[PDB]
Amino acid sequence: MMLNRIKVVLAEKQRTNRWLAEQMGKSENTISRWCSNKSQPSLDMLVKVAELLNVDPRQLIN
Amino acid sequence: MMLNRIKVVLAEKQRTNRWLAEQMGKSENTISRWCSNKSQPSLDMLVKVAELLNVDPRQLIN
């Protein structure tokens, strides 16, 4: 199994689901589903999230 | 940057793009684009690919 850590990293970086969705041109629902691990980003989307949160993309994977 | 290693692992495991596409219910074009790193699987798709190739999903990420 492989999940993402976007919810934890968002909190650590003091950012919201709304902010991330706006930066990525995606719906807040999409981001929320990634955060809850109900659905998953593609690897390229994960890289963009990491760039936006100023972390290594490896840190977004569990 | 983050890419996938599906093309290398397919070759190592003696499997084809066609086989993988058939197992995943996806088009061969989709798999070929993952193999060439022109597009990327979601994390859950990567887990299914890893299961099918009998590898740890971590081995599919570069």
From TrEMBL, chains A, B:
The keyword Signal does not apply. Transmembrane segments: none annotated. One of its GO terms (molecular function) is DNA binding. The keyword Protein biosynthesis does not apply. Keywords: DNA-binding. Residues 20-60 form the HTH cro/C1-type domain. This is DNA-binding protein. The chain holds residues 7 to 68 of 73 of the full protein.
